[PDB]
Design a protein around this ligand. Structure first.
Ligand code: GTP
Ligand code: GDP
Ligand code: CA
Ligand code: MG
Ligand code: MG
Ligand code: MG
Lengths: 67, 440, 422
């Protein structure tokens, strides 16, 4: 009986720790992924904007090769 | 011992916090400077009100509370208003930029920048407790902070305080006073992410409170101030067992044992009576039987739904004021001989009763009549899932066209999180159907 | 918190000037920058649009831009003309000549960096910048071409802030300048990608209101502009005064923009100066009160913001807002529940006991774009006046690309108009 009593409480500990561990890891995953996703969204915006610049230089350059 | 820490998150959370703490102060005889002349042990104690208030050596009774919001203008009113001396400044935490009605900003973009500080301050409250029982978290479903920051916080609290109890007071959205089209998204996202981290959650349907204010208090166009005063009476009724002592007093945790048959089925329906104007209450003494009767009138529920079309899994009556068991028992006997109170076949049908003798109080300048006795019923009914059904349907309408979803995706979220949250909600509605089906 | 205001070109600077005169009065700020009002509600959110300087002075957080020096002389001599910060005036010497390519690629580009230096100075001093608002026309050259350049340039440096425009759409009824449909389409091409929310201030609508409703035989830019400032005051009230709904640029966008490209609003106002809450409400939803020449009964609403101002019964406002939705249910998309939001502010605009401002995201806005498109094509298919643009370096492809994008925008507004819940 004592062996069983010892196993019940160790089981309760293990499950509570496992719950903490899994909450902890799920959160780190979500935050990592969120960070990357957002950064990738902003990076694409800037690249698009920088192609706009690229394109305006190309325009001024063509006006010059016309004059 | 048995301390409870309150955390008020975002505008709704904070403003409801204002109302509750003002009310607690009045109930306990605490002045707005924090002094409480009736309390003879200076700088500490183990009185029942100490579950919610700590004490400094100088005799100040300080709420065990943190207020958090991502913009400052609501908390700035606490900092500068009537109960400003009640709170240590570090208990009131603000960012500069809010979540803009966007769960993703509350949980991630903006929320991530203040979360460690918030936990630091909560930890400071915890360290002053000798037997912390758990947390009470107040927040809207609909706001970006109320939804997304609350979720983040609950997730972090599970990690940092293990299985310590976490109870919510959750403001469910109504079109009469809602401020964002995307509230159904925020509501489903936060309900999904918080569900495994909360032990018990009292939903407060703004439309139910709005109707009660219009109909029972004759308020033409209720403001948050009207709503919040009524909410605070209900919150006070639920927490009174923690804050007062008494022979007939029954601890909230004991009601919880009966209220939660399975971890996910943890949303009690609260019903409160009497809500009556000073004009109507004058020369009209509402008896124990009358207020108990009123608990089974759906118009008095804090969430719109029809318990008469569902099944009960528990019924608890929390009385306060001038009430004795004889009268309660007689009232209950009548109600059984005349009402649609049907229980699932696997639950006992006995009503669980607690009585706190301290009479209800009202805030000066308020709408509610001061009464001699009041009651809050907490029932676990399958009907509460109607509230999830209404919300889930609004979510579906928009999500089918992916309306507004780019606002979340732009803040780093994925469609996968939407479908995952919605599926969890589908499974929850199914859980509520299953528990009502008869045993084989 | 802080908004940074930019006004570009003649139209932009003119309607920009009226905007500041009008809200300055509302906030009790005089031409010298001193406060002399009667209500603390005037000062509570004053920092959204004004910087506070030494001497208890309030300085519009405003930047004044043009390739033509004349406009900002006239500004400087306007009533509140001395209120603006001298260093915030950035003017060229050339002129744009209604050439979008000049404003966008050559002349304007030559001046843009000096404008940025000013935006940066203003942004750096902000406690927590919300974003930007730009006033400009789309038919001219500077406001349209340089204005859209500025937007993209500002976006590169403040990619996470809200970009809002008040964009004046061209009408033959107001300006005979033949190439305006070129300038407008090229502009819309930019706005569709680089703004979060655009108010379509349509000269077509403004003329029609002044002429038909106000019975003004010959509307001046003054007449048109009275409508514009009234509208601008109204649609910014929730930003400038204490309140719950749409109190900042991002919350407004989150409420109003269900699909990123579909961010072109139809503003409206009542009364239009031959009054009850039901009457106010009915008119704010009437096509005759729209500042964009589109019939909302020719499409459906994605979202709506209604703002009431003055002393009135909120109960009655709520009932009437419910009434119009019920009786006109067909005209609000069913798959966005509760898509109409209402605010009431106690302080009425100058000269009115009460008023209503309307902000609609209606698929009927395609009538505006179709109208530009028709005029664009009449010209482009005859390659009329193209050498102006090719001459600054552009090619025909960009013209084709701008037209296709705008045509796409119309198709998208039509798509959602036809969508159903089931
Ligand atoms: N009962 C009640 N509901 C409120 C109150 N304030 C806001 N709400 C409701 O809460 C929801 C909006 O969320 P808020 O709490 O204002 O927003 P928030 O949590 O501050 O989030 P962000 O502003 O987006 O950062 C809506 O459904 C409102 O009707 C209040 O004081 N009392
Ligand atoms: N509503 C209005 N429109 C204007 C005003 N001034 C110019 N416009 C319009 O703007 C277009 C011409 O652009 P404009 O601003 O004058 O040229 P810019 O200086 O190069 O930006 C035409 O369609 C004009 O009708 C004004 O004060 N009010
Ligand atoms: Ca004590
Ligand atoms: Mg907020
Ligand atoms: Mg010009
Ligand atoms: Mg001109």
């Amino acid at each position: 009986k004592r062996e069983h009593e010892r196993e019940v409480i160790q089981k309760a500990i293990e499950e509570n720790n496992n719950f903490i561990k899994m909450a902890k890891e799920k959160l780190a995953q979500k935050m990592e992924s969120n960070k990357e996703n957002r950064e990738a969204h902003l990076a694409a915006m800037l690249e698009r904007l920088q192609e706009k610049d690229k394109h305006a230089e190309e325009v001024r350059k063509n006006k010059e090769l016309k004059e | 011992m048995r301390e409870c820490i309150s955390i008020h998150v975002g505008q709704a959370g904070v403003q409801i916090g204002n109302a509750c703490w003002e009310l607690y102060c009045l109930e306990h005889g605490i002045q707005p400077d924090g002094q409480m002349p009736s309390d003879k042990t200076i700088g500490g104690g183990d009185d029942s009100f100490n579950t919610f208030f700590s004490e400094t050596g100088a005799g100040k009774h300080v709420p065990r509370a943190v207020f958090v919001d991502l913009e400052p203008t609501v908390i700035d009113e606490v900092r500068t208003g009537t109960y400003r001396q009640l709170f240590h400044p570090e208990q009131l935490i603000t960012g500069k930029e809010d979540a803009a009605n966007n769960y993703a900003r509350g949980h991630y973009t903006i929320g991530k920048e203040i979360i460690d500080l918030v936990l630091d301050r909560i930890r400071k409250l915890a360290d002053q407790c000798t037997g912390l029982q758990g947390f009470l978290v107040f927040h809207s479903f609909g706001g970006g902070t109320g939804s997304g920051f609350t979720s983040l916080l609950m997730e972090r609290l599970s990690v940092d305080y293990g299985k310590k109890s976490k109870l919510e007071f959750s403001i469910y959205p109504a079109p009469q006073v809602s401020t964002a089209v995307v509230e159904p998204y925020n509501s489903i996202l936060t309900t999904h992410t918080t569900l495994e981290h909360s032990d018990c959650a009292f939903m407060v349907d703004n439309e139910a409170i709005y109707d009660i204010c219009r109909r029972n208090l004759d308020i033409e166009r209720p403001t948050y101030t009207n709503l919040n005063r009524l909410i605070s009476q209900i919150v006070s009724s639920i927490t009174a067992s923690l804050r007062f002592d008494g022979a007939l007093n029954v601890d909230l945790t004991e009601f919880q044992t009966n209220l939660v048959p399975y971890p996910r089925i943890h949303f009690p329906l609260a019903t409160y009576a009497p809500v009556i104007s000073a004009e109507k209450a004058y020369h009209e003494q509402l008896s124990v039987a009358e207020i108990t009767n009123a608990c089974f009138e759906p118009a008095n529920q804090m969430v719109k739904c029809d318990p008469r079309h569902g099944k009960y899994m528990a019924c608890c009556l929390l009385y306060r004021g001038d009430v004795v068991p004889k009268d309660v028992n007689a009232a209950i006997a009548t109600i059984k001989t005349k009402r649609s109170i049907q229980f699932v076949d696997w639950c006992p049908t006995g009503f669980k009763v607690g009585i706190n003798y301290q009479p209800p109080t009202v805030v000066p300048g308020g709408d509610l009549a001061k009464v001699q006795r009041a009651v809050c019923m907490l029932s676990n009914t399958t009907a509460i899932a109607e509230a999830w059904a209404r919300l889930d349907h609004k979510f579906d309408l928009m999500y089918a066209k992916r309306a507004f979803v780019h606002w979340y995706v732009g803040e780093g979220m994925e469609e996968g999180e939407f479908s995952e949250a919605r599926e969890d909600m589908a499974a929850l509605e199914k859980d509520y159907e299953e528990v009502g089906v008869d045993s084989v | 918190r802080e908004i940074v205001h930019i006004q570009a070109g003649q139209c932009g600077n003119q309607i920009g000037a009226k905007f500041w005169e009008v809200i300055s009065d509302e906030h009790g700020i005089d031409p010298t920058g001193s406060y002399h009002g009667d209500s603390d509600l005037q000062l509570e959110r004053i920092n959204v649009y004004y910087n506070e300087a030494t001497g208890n002075k309030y300085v519009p957080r405003a930047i004044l831009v043009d390739l033509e020096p004349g406009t900002m002389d006239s500004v400087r001599s306007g009533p509140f003309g001395q209120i603006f910060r001298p260093d915030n005036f950035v003017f060229g010497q050339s002129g744009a000549g209604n050439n979008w390519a000049k404003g966008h690629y050559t002349e304007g580009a030559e001046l843009v960096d000096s404008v940025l230096d000013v935006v940066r100075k203003e942004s750096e001093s902000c406690d927590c910048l919300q974003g930007f608002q730009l006033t400009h026309s789309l038919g001219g050259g500077t406001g349209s071409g340089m204005g859209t350049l500025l937007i993209s340039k500002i976006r590169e440096e403040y990619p996470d802030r809200i970009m809002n425009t008040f964009s004046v759409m061209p009408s033959p009824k107001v300006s005979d300048t033949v190439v305006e449909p070129y300038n407008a389409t090229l502009s819309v091409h930019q706005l569709v990608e680089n703004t979060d929310e655009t108010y379509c201030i349509d000269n077509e609508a403004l003329y029609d209101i002044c002429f038909r409703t106000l019975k003004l035989t010959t509307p001046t830019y003054g007449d048109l502009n009275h409508l514009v400032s009234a509208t601008m005051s109204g649609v910014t009230t929730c930003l400038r005064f204490p309140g719950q709904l749409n109190a900042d640029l991002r919350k407004l966008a989150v409420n109003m923009v269900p699909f990123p490209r579909l961010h072109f609003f139809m503003p409206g106002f009542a009364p239009l100066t031959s009054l009850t809450v039901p009457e106010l409400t009915q008119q704010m939803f009437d096509s005759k009160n729209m500042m964009a020449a589109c019939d909302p009964r020719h499409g459906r609403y994605l979202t709506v913001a209604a703002i009431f101002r003055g002393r009135m019964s909120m109960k009655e406002v709520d009932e009437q807002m419910l009434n119009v939705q019920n009786k006109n249910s067909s005209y609000f998309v069913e798959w966005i529940p509760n898509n109409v939001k209402t605010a009431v502010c106690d302080i009425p605009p100058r000269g009115l006991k009460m008023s209503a401002t309307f902000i609609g995201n209606s698929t009927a806005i395609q009538e505006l774009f179709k109208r530009i498109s028709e005029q664009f094509t009449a010209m482009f298919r005859r390659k009329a006046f193209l050498h102006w643009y090719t001459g600054e370096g552009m090619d025909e492809m960009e013209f084709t690309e701008a037209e296709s994008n705008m045509n796409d925008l119309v198709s998208e507004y039509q798509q959602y108009q036809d969508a159903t819940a089931d």
